[PDB]
């Protein structure tokens, strides 16, 4: 009767993976996809009632990615491979946009979790958690949407786990801190799957039983309204609580509201 839903958000930003491939490093996007598929198969093998969802983010949008081995796992892997191949082959750079649309993927994941919750029988509770792997740099332009997503996830009690590969993201740290999730930075990319099989694999009840690394130093720098950049000290309005980097005779937001 214990229903566990795992949603894996994969940062498939073409620029970062292209740079990694040009670096000729030991880790590639193919290995990351294989590790994600193995983690999903392990999660499904943990319990029959467990459900899996995979969403891949891109500059364009978010795509729902979902012979000796399990038949259902074979079909799931084939579907994931077909979806990722379709997304990558049809991915055409049309515009100057480069930041990953991480907020949209999280919103779609929350919508999918909400949809699945209603279909769940009343006698069972569907415990849901979201795992995010970060490859490219964080986007500061989507601060408000990211915070809204964090608050929505906290309202429904949905864990958010962050697995940073190269560049640490403050937004992911804040999400993990607020939602109670786990934030972890990968020291060695080729060993990534092992971490996925050691830290994020157990459920929240199982995490209490086991011993986990302490949370990293979470930052709480805000984003200025007129700059959309991280700041430490700024001017905050006393009415709409808007944050400004520099003093202004009149609040722009308050002037907007009539």
């Amino acid at each position: 009767d214990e229903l566990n839903l795992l949603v894996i958000v994969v940062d498939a930003n073409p620029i970062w993976w292209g740079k990694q491939a040009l670096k000729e490093s030991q880790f590639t996007l193919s290995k990351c996809i294989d590790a994600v598929m193995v983690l999903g198969n392990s999660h499904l093998f943990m319990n029959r009632s467990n459900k899996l969802a995979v969403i891949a983010s891109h500059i364009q949008e978010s795509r729902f990615l979902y012979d000796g081995k399990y038949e259902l796992l074979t079909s799931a892997n084939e579907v994931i491979v077909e979806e990722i191949k379709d997304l990558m082959t049809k991915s055409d750079i049309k515009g100057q946009h480069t930041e990953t649309l991480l907020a949209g993927s999280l919103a779609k994941a929350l919508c999918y979790i909400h949809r699945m919750n209603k279909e769940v029988k009343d006698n069972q509770e569907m415990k849901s958690r979201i795992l995010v792997i970060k490859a490219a740099e964080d986007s500061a332009l989507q601060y408000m949407n990211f915070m809204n997503v964090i608050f929505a996830a906290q309202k429904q009690n949905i864990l958010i786990d962050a697995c940073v590969l190269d560049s640490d993201s403050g937004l992911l740290q804040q999400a993990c801190d607020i939602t109670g999730g786990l934030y972890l930075k990968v020291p060695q990319m080729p060993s990534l799957l092992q971490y996925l099989l050691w830290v994020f694999l157990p459920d929240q009840d199982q995490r209490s039983q086991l011993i986990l690394p302490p949370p990293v130093h979470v930052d709480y720098r805000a984003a200025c309204f007129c700059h959309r950049n991280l700041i430490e000290i700024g001017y905050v309005c006393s009415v709409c609580l808007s944050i400004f980097c520099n003093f202004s005779p009149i609040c722009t937001t308050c002037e907007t509201a009539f």
């Binding site: 740079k19 060695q188 060993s191």
Partner: protein
């Protein structure tokens, strides 16, 4: 005089602070009482390269993980590892004995009071406050020389691994940098 003596006797911490700040000539008594009162087309080339590389992609099983990598990850995730540092101030409650801890708390209180006076003076909008900030800086330097240097010597003699002095040094350096920046801006405004 009698009122000052009574006030000092009432609070032993205040008496100790007055002894450390006035008897050691760190600050004058008058000031103490007054205070009390992107790139080129290389990105597109990389995008095309990764698109072509992942266009012909096949799943792998053996290449995903290796025994050495798994063992290294387990060792790192084992207690006492890099990600599982088990020290985390193991005996901080018993390290740096409370006799030193009381002195550290007194120094923290003194630094907090002096920096509170400094930040209350800031910003300097009148010529009167210009000399007061200089006096506060001189008092801070005298307090540092009088207390922190013997404190650092005592720590070195007892060989404490805790970086207790680091926080005080950071606060003093931040205050000095802020004062230097404000003085430079004041000089620039006169140019």
């Amino acid at each position: 005089l009698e009122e000052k003596n009574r006030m000092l006797q009432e609070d032993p911490v205040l008496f100790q602070l007055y002894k450390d700040l006035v008897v050691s000539q760190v600050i004058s008594a008058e000031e103490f009482w007054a205070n009390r009162l992107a790139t080129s087309q290389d990105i597109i080339n990389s995008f095309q390269s990764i698109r072509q590389e992942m266009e012909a992609y096949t799943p792998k099983l053996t290449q995903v993980l290796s025994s050495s990598a798994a063992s290294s990850t387990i060792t790192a995730l084992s207690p006492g590892g890099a990600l599982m540092q088990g020290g985390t101030q193991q005996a901080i409650n018993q390290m740096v004995p409370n006799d030193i801890q009381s002195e550290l708390k007194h120094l923290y209180v003194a630094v907090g009071e002096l920096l509170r006076h400094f930040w209350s003076c800031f910003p300097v909008n009148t010529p009167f406050l210009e000399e007061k900030v200089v006096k506060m800086k001189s008092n801070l330097e005298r307090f540092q020389v009088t207390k922190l240097c013997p404190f650092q010597e005592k720590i070195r003699r007892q060989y404490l691994s805790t970086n207790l002095v680091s926080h005080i040094e950071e606060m003093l350096q931040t205050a000095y940098n802020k004062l230097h920046t404000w003085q430079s801006r004041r000089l620039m405004k006169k140019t």
